[PDB]
Paper text:
Phytochromes are biliproteins of plants, bacteria and fungi that use red light as a source of information to regulate fundamental physiological processes, such as photosynthesis, seed germination, flowering and shade avoidance.
Starting point of the present studies was the crystal structure of the PCM fragment of wild-type Agp2 (Agp2-PCM) in the dark adapted Pfr state, which crystallized in the orthorhombic space group P212121. The parent Pfr state of Agp2-PAiRFP2 (2.03 Å resolution) displays the same structure as the wild-type protein determined here as well (2.50 Å resolution). A hydrogen-bonding network around the propionate side chains of rings B and C involves the side chains of Tyr165, Arg211 and His278 and is extended via several ordered water molecules to include also Tyr205, Arg242, Ser245, His248, Ser260 and Ser262. In contrast to PaBphP-PCM, the tongue region of Agp2-PCM is not directly stabilized by crystallographic contacts to symmetry-related molecules within the crystal. The chromophore interaction interface to the surrounding amino acids, especially potential hydrogen bonds, hydrophobic interactions and water molecules, are almost identical for the Pfr states of both Agp2-PCM variants. The Pfr Agp2-PCM crystals lose their diffraction capability immediately after irradiation with far-red light at ambient temperatures indicating major protein conformational changes in the crystal.
Author numbering:
A (entry chain B): 6 to 80, 86 to 503
B (entry chain A): 6 to 80, 85 to 120, 123 to 503
């Protein structure tokens, strides 16, 4: 098997048959009696002799260590820093069970503070963040300062799966990717699945030598599943991508919001680098708190936007009761509805007359739009972020208005309060350098940030920022309020 | 102050001037240089001699201990320090805080780790996927783990009264499950302290109170013991516990929206106090309980609101195919009882009554409708005390004590009405009415029997209050019905 751009979307990266050289790996049977597999560098690091497969775990590791590892197993992978081996030495061991196999991963110990102490220091620096913007800004600076990586970013996954760089702390000499996007294909489903499963993903050396697991394919033809093994080797594609950037190493912290991958906190370094296990425990704890605090802020934000909308629509209902002419009130008031949700324009289409405000289509194109919604909707809110896919003629004005949300004012007449958004590329706040070129490998320019961003621009060409579930809930509240205004008007007139 | 039944609602329980005998207390100045106050038992427990006041902290505690405590004081809640050294080779569990201008140090003799015990308890409640399940697990779990004779959970009602919503007890004890106590049984100052402190400890309800020397200092100021866990108990509550047979207790406060949702109350029928490490764990457990309770409450609310929308959305689609909207409502009104908790429901349209479940008789509906027309401003009107608004409603208060009214029109006085029974009719009380209690000098007021009777009087002729969630559902329904009438006007 030879990974390339044709088949890399289905690469079995969970069973590479190699590990990274910053530790060694031993795979035992389910009960941890027999050594079934081992990495080739086990002899170097653990100071072991000849061939490990066939020997008992007690023989290889000692009675005392096996006893202790069986205890941690009984009580995600179990993280055991500063374990004492048979010789006069200390090792950071991680331990888990998946499929039938028990995988044991080893790292030379160092001198580290307690994980809980380090995590607690970090968490205390983001508790007082009272908005999502504040939290997202703090975290990249704080993580860079605590972990000591050259760049730290936060990606937020969009509705189509693309990633958006929403925060960045970098070395001053590096180029920026803040406000940049990458398309969904840059992270394949299998990689996303492992980001969802594992909190941390470590890469020590993008140009490092892959240490083989022996055997790669066992007596029965089965490969070793390394899904939860933190020493699992990296795809040649992503390694080439990192090399083209000049990145030698990385660590990701996954952000889990609704049991789903909201994004990543991505730490990159421009020379080989790995954190010790105790600092990785703390990073995992910090990631957990970051995700919870983000979720609280995100709800508070949502609740405040919905309540704002209700308060505005409530005020509008009371004003409207004192008006004999409802069409006139809307002609004067419609632009105030733009305040209810993010939009670049709003307009009123009543009795074949157009009144616009902000970035809208020209008045010639509105009849076509209103006619489409009349056929497409069943008398409730219709919305899209890709007008050209629905109405080919809309491509002409896509720069000014690529998306549309229509609120019906009547089930009899073809009247609408319309909301609009610009082409998403028009609202780019990219802080990067367009003259930054990139080195390439055998795969070519595909594996560079320049070409990734350009591919993303193509994926969203003639499209706007999608209408969120929150926006649609506000739209429904607005429709409902206007039905109420019309009915109370009918009652008294 | 000599507290009694006349004035116990305003008792300054934050400044009793005494502590409980299971530890000793030392009060220092703001910078922890000088000893200003000390409890009378400090000599016994700490092995010190003479009047401790006027001596330096360095003198009384030694140079090392003072240095270590000053470091802890830099680390907003009492610092808990288990297994601390005094240089006799004596271990003490020390709690430490600053409040007002006073540093308070509290000592207990020492005797597993907190994170391990809390961890085991939390794992036993993580998988609860309903408020009912969490509440039921927790009393059994806490009882088994902390070894108390009874564990209860109270949920505070909107009027301040507490309801016993869960219970784990010794089999020979009486049950208080499904019982209520009135707001007056926990005064505002006690509530404020329950909100401020996660744990409240009572080692001995018949134990002798150790005075704090001095109770009133040269300046005339008392010692504020609001965050001191050794703070002594009111004589009123001690008498209350003695009447029950309870000798000791530990409360864990449940905080939901920065507000006292309830307590996890542990009672014991002989003296009892948990060591500091176990109390740390209980505090950690209480924190998780509160968070997990909050997550389940939101899920429960979200599901009820979405259910209501799905029903109302279905009703809108069906109504589009009906030429007669009055007829549709006459056939469908009883289905609206599924939207929110209620004991009855009825339609009042064109001076015609159609009822279902526990409602007032048709005779009384004109009076009720007329009152809502005058009281409301065209939106949802609701009460849980009909007698207070309409005296004549006392006649049918047994059947219908609370009402929620949804206006169907601003021209006509038409309504969809929702009813609830007298709250005493829906009691599910598992206790024994034949269980009597002994009394002290204050009398039978300080007994569970009289408390429950007092609560019954406070809610007489009233129903379960209409919650903010019930009101949101009502507003969704009103709005839905307006849209039905409007779309009906459009095509007819
Ligand atoms: C056909 C397969 C491709 C592919 C596979 C993998 N990508 C993995 C990681 C990865 N890739 C990116 C993409 C980026 N796009 C950018 O524009 C950009 C910077 C400007 C980056 C860094 C990201 C963000 C990630 C993960 C997060 C991170 O490290 O920052 C990956 C997993 C690697 C692993 O095993 O750890 C695989 C496999 N990437 C492709 O582009 C295509 C062709
Ligand atoms: C005029 C003042 C009164 C008063 C004061 C205090 N009550 C405190 C605690 C307390 N009291 C109760 C009431 C109960 N009513 C019951 O029916 C009942 C059993 C079925 C009980 C236990 C409760 C629930 C509590 C909470 C503590 C616990 O559950 O153990 C209190 C604070 C004591 C302290 O310092 O810790 C004060 C002060 N209680 C009265 O009844 C009146 C008259």
């Amino acid at each position: 098997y030879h990974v390339d751009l044709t088949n890399c979307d289905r690469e079995p990266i969970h069973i590479p048959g190699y590990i990274q050289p910053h530790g060694c790996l031993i795979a035992c049977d389910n009960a941890m009696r027999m050594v079934l597999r081992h990495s080739e560098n086990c002899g170097e690091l653990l100071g072991l002799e000849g061939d490990l497969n066939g020997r008992t775990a007690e023989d290889v590791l000692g009675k005392k260590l096996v006893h202790d590892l069986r205890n941690a197993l009984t009580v995600r992978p179990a993280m055991l820093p500063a374990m004492e081996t048979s010789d006069g030495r200390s090792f950071d061991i991680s331990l888990h069970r998946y499929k039938s196999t028990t995988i044991i991963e080893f790292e030379p110990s160092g001198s580290d503070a307690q994980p809980l102490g380090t995590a607690r220091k970090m968490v205390d620096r983001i508790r007082e963040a009272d908005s999502v913007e504040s939290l997202i800004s703090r975290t990249t600076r704080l993580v860079k300062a605590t972990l000591g990586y050259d760049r730290v970013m936060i990606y937020r996954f969009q509705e189509d799966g693309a990633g958006k760089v929403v925060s960045e702390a970098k070395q001053p000499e590096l180029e920026s990717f803040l406000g940049q996007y990458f398309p969904a294909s840059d992270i394949p489903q299998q990689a996303r699945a492992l980001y969802l499963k594992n909190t941390l993903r470590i890469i020590s050396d993008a140009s490092g030598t892959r240490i083989p697991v022996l055997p790669a394919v066992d007596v029965s033809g089965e490969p070793l599943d390394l899904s939860y093994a933190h020493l699992r080797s990296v795809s040649p594609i992503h390694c080439e991508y990192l090399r083209n950037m000049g990145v030698a190493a990385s660590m990701s912290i996954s952000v889990i919001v609704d049991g789903a991958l909201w994004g990543l906190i991505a730490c990159h370094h421009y020379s080989p680098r790995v954190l010790s296990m105790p600092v990785r425990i703390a990073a995992e704890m910090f990631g957990e708190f970051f995700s919870m605090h983000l979720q609280v802020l995100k709800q508070k934000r949502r609740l405040d936007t919905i309540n704002h909308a209700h308060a505005a629509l409530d005020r509008f209902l009371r004003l409207a009761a004192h008006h004999a002419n409802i069409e006139e009130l809307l002609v004067d008031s419609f632009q105030d509805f733009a305040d209810l949700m993010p939009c670049d324009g709003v307009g009123l289409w009543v009795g074949n007359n157009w009144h616009g405000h902000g970035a809208t289509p020209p008045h010639d194109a509105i009849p076509r739009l209103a006619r489409f919604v009349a056929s497409a909707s069943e008398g409730r809110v219709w919305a899209t972020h890709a007008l050209s896919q629905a109405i080919p003629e809309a491509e002409i004005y896509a720069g000014t208005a690529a998306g549309m949300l229509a609120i019906p004012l009547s089930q009899v007449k073809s009247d609408y309060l319309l909301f609009f958004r610009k082409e998403i590329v028009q609202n780019l706040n990219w802080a990067g350098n367009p003259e930054k070129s990139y080195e390439t490998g055998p795969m070519g320019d595909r594996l560079t940030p320049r070409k990734s961003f350009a591919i993303w621009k193509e994926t969203v060409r003639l499209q706007a920022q999608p209408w969120s579930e929150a926006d649609r809930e506000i739209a429904e509240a607005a429709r409902i309020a206007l039905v109420e205004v019309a009915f109370h008007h009918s009652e008294h007139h």
